[PDB]
Every structure is written in C-alpha cells, then in structure tokens.
Amino acid sequence: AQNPNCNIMIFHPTKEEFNDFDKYIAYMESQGAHRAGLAKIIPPKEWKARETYDNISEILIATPLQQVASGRAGVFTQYHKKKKAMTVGEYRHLANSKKYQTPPHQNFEDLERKYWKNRIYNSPIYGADISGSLFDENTKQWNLGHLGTIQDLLEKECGVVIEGVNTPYLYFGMWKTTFAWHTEDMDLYSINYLHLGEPKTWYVVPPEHGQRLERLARELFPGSSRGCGAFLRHKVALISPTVLKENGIPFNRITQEAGEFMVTFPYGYHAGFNHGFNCAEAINFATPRWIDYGKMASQCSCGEARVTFSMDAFVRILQPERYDLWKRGQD
Numbered sequence: 001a002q003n004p005n006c007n008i009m010i011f012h013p014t015k016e017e018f019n020d021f022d023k024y025i026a027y028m029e030s031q032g033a034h035r036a037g038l039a040k041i042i043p044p045k046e047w048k049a050r051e052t053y054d055n056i057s058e059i060l061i062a063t064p065l066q067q068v069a070s071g072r073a074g075v076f077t078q079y080h081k082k083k084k085a086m087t088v089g090e091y092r093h094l095a096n097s098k099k100y101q102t103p104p105h106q107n108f109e110d111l112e113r114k115y116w117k118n119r120i121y122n123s124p125i126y127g128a129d130i131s132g133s134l135f136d137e138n139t140k141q142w143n144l145g146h147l148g149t150i151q152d153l154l155e156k157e158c159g160v161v162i163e164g165v166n167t168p169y170l171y172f173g174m175w176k177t178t179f180a181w182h183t184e185d186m187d188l189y190s191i192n193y194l195h196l197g198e199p200k201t202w203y204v205v206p207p208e209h210g211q212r213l214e215r216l217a218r219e220l221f222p223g224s225s226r227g228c229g230a231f232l233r234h235k236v237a238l239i240s241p242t243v244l245k246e247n248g249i250p251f252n253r254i255t256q257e258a259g260e261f262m263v264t265f266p267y268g269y270h271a272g273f274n275h276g277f278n279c280a281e282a283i284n285f286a287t288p289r290w291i292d293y294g295k296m297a298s299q300c301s302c303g304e305a306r307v308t309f310s311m312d313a314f315v316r317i318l319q320p321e322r323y324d325l326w327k328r329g330q331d
C-alpha cells in the first residue's frame with residue numbers, strides 16, 4: 001500500500017505531465033497521495049496562470065465577512081458578520097493597515113504559534129466565495145475555469161444526465177482569516193491555486209481517520225452536535241493542532257505559497273489560515289473514485305449549511321433515501 005503513514009506528498013510535474021489533468025490526479029493517487037487528504041503540486045517553471053496581477057484592484061468584494069470568534073484559543077467557533085462592499089484595492093489597503101497587518105515574525109512556525117495564541121482576540125475580514133476566475137483564457141494547463149464538470153463526470157460514470165454547473169470561486173484573505181474544519185460538499189475533491197500574496201497554512205486529517213475528528217468535534221462542541229448530526233457542514237468550528245495532538249487525532253500540516261496548487265481529496269477534513277493579504281482561486285471536481293464517497297457523504301438537514309443549486313442533483317441521484325429530508329433543510 002503506497003503512503004501508509006498518510007503523509008502530505010509534494011509533486012513537481014514536468015510541462016509534458018501538466019497537459020492531462022485527469023491523468024496526473026490518477027498518477028498522484030497511484031503513489032498514495034490521497035491517503036493524506038491533501039497534496040501540493042508545484043507547476044513546471046514554464047507555466048503561468050496569467051501575465052500579471054497589476055490590474056485586479058477593481059474586482060468587487062460585494063459582501064466582505066468579519067470573522068468573529070467565541071470560545072477558547074484552541075477550541076472556538078466563528079460567525080461571519082456581513083460588512084459593506086469594497087474593491088480588492090480597498091481590501092488590500094485594509095489588510096495592510098496597522099489594525100490588520102501581519103505582525104513581525106521569524107519564520108512560518110513562529111507565525112503559526114502567534115495565530116493559535118491570538119486569533120480569537122481579533123476579527124479579520126475575508127472576501128469569500130466570489131464567483132470568478134483569474135486564469136487567462138489562453139492558459140491551457142490546470143486552468144480552474146476549464147476543468148471537466150462534475151455533472152459530466154456523473155453522466156459519464158452513471159449514465160444519468162443532470163442539471164447544474166460547476167464554476168470557480170475567488171478568495172481574498174488577510175492575516176488571521178480562517179477556514180474552519182470541513183470536507184467538501186458531497187465529499188468532492190477541491191483544487192486551490194494561490195494566485196498572489198502571502199501564504200496559507202493548511203491542516204488535514206487522512207480520509208481513513210475522518211470519523212476520529214468527527215467524534216472529537218461532537219465532544220468539543222456538544223450543543224452544536226445536538227443541533228445537527230453533521231454540524232461540521234456549517235463550517236464554523238476550529239480545533240488547534242495542540243488540541244488535536246492531546247486527543248490523539250491523526251493529522252498533518254503544510255504551508256502553501258503563491259504559485260502553488262493544493263488538492264484536497266474526498267472526505268479529507270481540512271482547516272487553515274492566511275498569513276497576510278492574498279488571493280486564491282478554488283473549485284470542486286470529481287473523478288471516478290469520488291462516486292462511492294458521494295454516495296456515503298453526510299448531510300446537514302437542520303437548515304444551517306445551505307448550499308449551491310448544483311448539490312440538489314447530486315443528492316437526488318446518489319442519495320435518494322436522504323433526498324426528501326435534505327431538501328426540507330434547503331427550504
């Protein structure tokens with residue numbers, strides 16, 4: 001069995017290997033990459049996403065979100081307070097202000113210590129889930145707006161034609177902006193490209209151990225767990241690496257830098273934080289191996305998780321017994 005310790009693997013495809021996206025994902029899985037729940041892909045030196053980032057300031061962040069924490073430093077939730085619209089140029093100036101800017105630090109490990117010590121005491125502002133793309137239309141390799149759609153994958157594997165579309169999303173971050181512990185909708189893959197700016201640190205639980213994370217989360221968030229049997233779908237709970245180690249939960253960590261891709265694999269729980277002003281692009285995707293995970297994915301029916309249009313068909317076709325209850329949660 002390849003990668004039996006579930007370590008995060010780092011890949012360096014050549015330009016020739018970077019042509020065929022599906023083939024390279026299957027190659028990484030042949031080497032055991034999915035066992036980690038997360039992999040890093042460094043593009044060949046010949047490749048670029050676009051020519052420059054000099055003309056992005058006028059993109060609008062219609063609903064910036066202030067991430068307000070409650071709890072203790074290592075075990076907290078966050079809620080998202082909506083703020084007034086601002087441009088990417090206005091948000092970058094805000095991220096660089098004395099109130100929000102990255103503090104002085106020695107290295108990524110010192111910054112990680114500072115994040116976990118101090119995050120709860122601040123409320124950083126995140127631009128999230130902004131439909132759009134920063135890949136040039138002429139970038140043919142690993143262009144996250146040109147991937148095969150999940151609807152087409154389901155049709156190819158299962159024969160059933162369904163409604164829905166699959167487009168990318170932009171994220172604009174600042175110091176301490178936080179992504180809570182979650183798997184993807186319908187336990188899909190994700191791919192994330194860090195276009196510019198400061199790093200993103202990730203934490204991940206191997207898919208084979210995801211239920212250990214869920215059992216800890218029920219213990220640490222006992223009111224939320226009574227409210228919903230899949231409350232991590234709400235994307236609000238944070239648990240620090242120190243708390244995970246104290247409780248014996250298997251996990252790994254890695255820092256993504258600008259110019260690098262990360263892939264999350266089906267049922268790989270992940271969480272993380274941004275080091276300073278940055279911009280990322282991400283989309284969900286599927287492969288043949290996903291279908292069995294989609295059939296088994298938990299679902300939130302309490303009303304909190306509220307998701308895209310295109311999840312309807314995935315539940316309807318893969319999980320017909322759960323469909324009626326889940327849809328009641330959507331309405």
Ligand SMILES: O=C(O)CNC(=O)C(=O)O
Binds near residue numbers: 191
């Ligand atoms: O970068 C972020 O805030 C969150 N991204 C992801 O969870 C992802 O790509 O799967």
Ligand SMILES: [Mg+2]
Binds near residue numbers: 056059
């Ligand atoms: Mg612009």
Ligand code: NI
Binds near residue numbers: 182183184190264
């Ligand atoms: Ni994710």
Ligand SMILES: [Zn+2]
Binds near residue numbers: 231233301302303
């Ligand atoms: Zn719920």
